Amino acid sequence: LVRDLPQGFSALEPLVDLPIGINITRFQTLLALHRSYLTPGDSSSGWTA
């Protein structure tokens, strides 16, 4: 029942350390397309808007 970031404290444990060794300046987020790009539905084809 919290739309935005909740108020509290949760420490972030280490997950993985990766030796890629390149330069990174920009990044993007990848999503999952449940609907169809060919035929877009009027509504509810996606996930609750």
Partner 1 sequence: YRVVVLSFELLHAPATVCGPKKSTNLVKNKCVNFNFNGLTGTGVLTESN
How is residue 46 written in tokens?
A: 């996606």
DSSP result, 11-25: ---------------
Which CB sits closer to partner 1, 6 or 19? 19
Residue (17 or 42) nearer to partner 1, CB: 17
Q: Establish if 21 lies at the interface with partner 1 (CB under 8 A).
A: yes
Contact between 19 and partner 1 per CB under 8 A = yes
| Nearest residue to 35 (alpha-carbon basis) of 44, 22, 26 | 44
Residue 8 or 21: which CB sits closer to partner 1?
Answer: 21
Q: How many residues bind partner 1 (CB under 8 A)?
A: 3
